[PDB]
Symmetry: D2
Subunit: 296 residues, 4 copies
Amino acid sequence: MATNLRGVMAALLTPFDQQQALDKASLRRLVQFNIQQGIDGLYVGGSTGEAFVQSLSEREQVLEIVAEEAKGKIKLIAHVGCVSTAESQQLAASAKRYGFDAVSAVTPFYYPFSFEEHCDHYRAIIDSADGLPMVVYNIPALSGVKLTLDQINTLVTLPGVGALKQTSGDLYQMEQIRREHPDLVLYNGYDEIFASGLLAGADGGIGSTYNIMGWRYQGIVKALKEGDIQTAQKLQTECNKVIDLLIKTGRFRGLKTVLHYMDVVSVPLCRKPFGPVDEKYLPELKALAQQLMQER
Amino acid sequence: ATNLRGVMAALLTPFDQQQALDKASLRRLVQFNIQQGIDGLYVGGSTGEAFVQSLSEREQVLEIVAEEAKGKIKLIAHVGCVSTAESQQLAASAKRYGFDAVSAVTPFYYPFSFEEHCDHYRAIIDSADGLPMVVYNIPALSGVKLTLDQINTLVTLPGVGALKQTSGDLYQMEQIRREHPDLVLYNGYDEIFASGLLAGADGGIGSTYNIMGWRYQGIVKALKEGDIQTAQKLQTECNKVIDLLIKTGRFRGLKTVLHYMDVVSVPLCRKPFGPVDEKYLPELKALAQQLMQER
Amino acid sequence: TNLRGVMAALLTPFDQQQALDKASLRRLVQFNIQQGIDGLYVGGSTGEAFVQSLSEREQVLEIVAEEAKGKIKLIAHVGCVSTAESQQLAASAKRYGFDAVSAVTPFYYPFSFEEHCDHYRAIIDSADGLPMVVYNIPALSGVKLTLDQINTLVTLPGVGALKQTSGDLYQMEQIRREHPDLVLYNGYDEIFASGLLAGADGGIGSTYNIMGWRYQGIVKALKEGDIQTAQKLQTECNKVIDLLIKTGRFRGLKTVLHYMDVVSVPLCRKPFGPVDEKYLPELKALAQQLMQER
Amino acid sequence: NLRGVMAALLTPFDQQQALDKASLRRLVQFNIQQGIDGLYVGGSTGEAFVQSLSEREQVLEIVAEEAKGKIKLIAHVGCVSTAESQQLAASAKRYGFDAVSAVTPFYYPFSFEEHCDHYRAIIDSADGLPMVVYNIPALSGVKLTLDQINTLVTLPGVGALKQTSGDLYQMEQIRREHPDLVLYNGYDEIFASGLLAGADGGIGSTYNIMGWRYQGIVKALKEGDIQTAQKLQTECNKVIDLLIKTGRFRGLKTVLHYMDVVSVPLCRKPFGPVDEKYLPELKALAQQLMQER
């Protein structure tokens, strides 16, 4: 329990004010809101936090504030990944300094790097994490990095690696990873297949939609544990109706908008080049916010 | 049953040393499947090596399988060819032989518009003279990438009664189920069967069902009884087998296991498919004996 | 001589009931010859071979040989997914007197590179002496070969050429560098001029049926160091290809040939559909333009 | 006039991975001395994506001090963030660059409309310096259609397109649709063919060590001498063959190191060092190129 990273953890969004600067008050509210719905932990500074449109200092500012708000209460994983190894090392040291339970790093992107280079990248960050377990981050869709199973097996067996965030829809590979690593903490990365992902071998998950309905995902975990497939399927279906909408509106901004109507986020904008939500979607988003609030 | 839902084995085509149809082995394999308690057979698809077969050779298999299983288990005839006219010929034969349904892969190699794909299916449905159509979506091998909207249009064409979904995208599997509550939806990738059912599929069609169809029936049963653990354990066992078949070559590996089970005389596939590497024989023989003992 | 040159990928004319239109096939063969084409690539993608039976493909090979053997070079594409079917067509091509055979990498089912090699070897054996033209077309076949694999295939005993249907002109140059004497056919008409500059010494294309003389003109212009002329010819070819891509390439070509009084009924076989009637004006005008120019 | 052959500048670092100002200046002067038409600074080749904004500005400022008014200077100010890209664009203006450039924002999926506003905003901050749209699908993961490309290149303020694509049919289509557009060939290994298809110049990393060969191909084709153009492209490709084996940027830095231009031939981590088995070939190449010109 004290060091168990297994569970349902929300990929935290980063609230900005009207001038696109960090909205500290809204960030703190989002953190407490997540804690309030019984989330197991928070994955901070990942893709969902718009880390790649933030500077290093801005990312450390978020990490620091989140730690003040939730250290001790729930598990905290800091995504310190950057294309640059040096930059990633700086964020890792900060994460440890702030008291995070673990660090994570997306496979470095844009430039083609050999597998050996990817491995040394992780080793160097692990060194700077000085004790904090590393969560390997496999998300080929956005990174463009396509690892094989043998390569994935090598990464998760590196000293200091304590988990794998599997943002892949291949549930055959999910089962193979579980079979090869019975004790590995394995996070399902695509919210829209959560139930199936757990059935294949994942033992938890990390996702952006957890910010507005994390309890549903917890419900699925419970349902599958008790053998209630009907309930598990029903919950996944409701999640997917929501995801269908968020894909039309834009996932991050759609979530920020729902959180805005829930009185958590002051201004629901993402950073440019991200545009605003198309006004034609507001009635559905408002209706969803109302529904979720009644449900919770 | 009075419907097409269920666990259907994708039938393999046994050949002799001369690469010619081995009827004796074909009949044995059909009876073997029936004995395993399978719900039906999907004949003339990828697994039956239909694409390295002539139209008349595919028709010959359809006739014999009908003679062996018609009235005993459901029979689905895959009549798909790149050509619409050739697909129609097989559909007419399937009707004459008394199959319960026809199926057709999205025509491949040449790029065709979605409208042309739709007219392709309409033409075949016409020739099937009443038999329902099972749309066959397998982007990995066909190279045809349909959107969800296109899949919805295809499954709602007059005469279409089901969809064989050979795709590992379980978000799409759930979306299809949500849009069509009564649709017969077969899971296509054996290695994700359990997850596929949980996502919305209500059955499946697979090549590995030939040697362990009872395991898949078991997963269906377990999930219906809310026994998640048993369903997972069964899927894990199937995947241990699939891992092996992928190393040896799936079709030839399956035929080799069937050989050791005294079903298939000569486990060869047709060229350009090569033989199984002899270094795998020990593992394949051990698997066959393990499966026979299991039954 | 040799197999280098501008070879037209032959189309297969059909009658009202989607059956071979023998009279039109003969006219198309003679039409190509009159354009001054160096040879014909028969039974390939362009001939709609993949929607024809072995018997139908053989019939076409036999007719074409009757019409052009001894007048121009003839390459028989005998490729099928099945090796045995491929060998049957190879044996027939030999019987009819074709100058060479060709085969697309077997598709649909995934095959190991060794299986691909054994496939070509078996067909070469059945070609009984005729040189093999390896056919690399990843876009349609789905088979993605590496340079080392391409090198291996082109040096197999019996291989005499390569039809490179790829827009990767770096690989085109590398292939020419590794094999200075290899017959190298440019497969994408829309980059013909650039392909030759990169290393190809000829080409095979469907659009050669209606404007082969233009490609012959590009070969000549480059040979004589006339870049501007080569560029202008390519631009004119691309203006045509732009249109053909909108209308559908094969049916668009057959429709142009119809207006040229060569093809009776310009339909392709189902599932291919007819040309959208809104394009008829453009296609007819193009036919008119080409006849004037020619 | 932005037409021409321009080297994608590399960013030299020291043993501790920090900018090596003296080598940076040496490389700029080296390019000038060998006759390059201009420099493309802060692009993929300059390892901009493993640098901070302040570090990229530092490079832009130094290069400007070294070559403004001597050769054309194009600043790649592209970042995923629009705001960040604008800061660099404003700086490029202050330093006196002749133009700015921006790769299509990556990692996160953006709508074409969002891509358009991104460029408009950067163009606004460039305060007068024309924009060079940068299409490179292989690395950005952004696949634009011809129509979208046409829309981008017609935006107010855009004066050129760096086409890093091996599709020469599209290259010809772009040239046909835009007769006067400055179109840079992006893949050095197909330079000759890219020019024949419609490019009227190029931008590339290998220009740092053999820019004159590309200048030679331009001349050859203009003079209708195919033979020489092909021979030159072939020699360039023999070199590119090697650089792909060693790793392009570090291979180039190594050659430049043996030519006494770059003090330390390292790229920033995660890039690893050059495999020692390749040094004999790299030393020989350096010797060859120094004796050649």
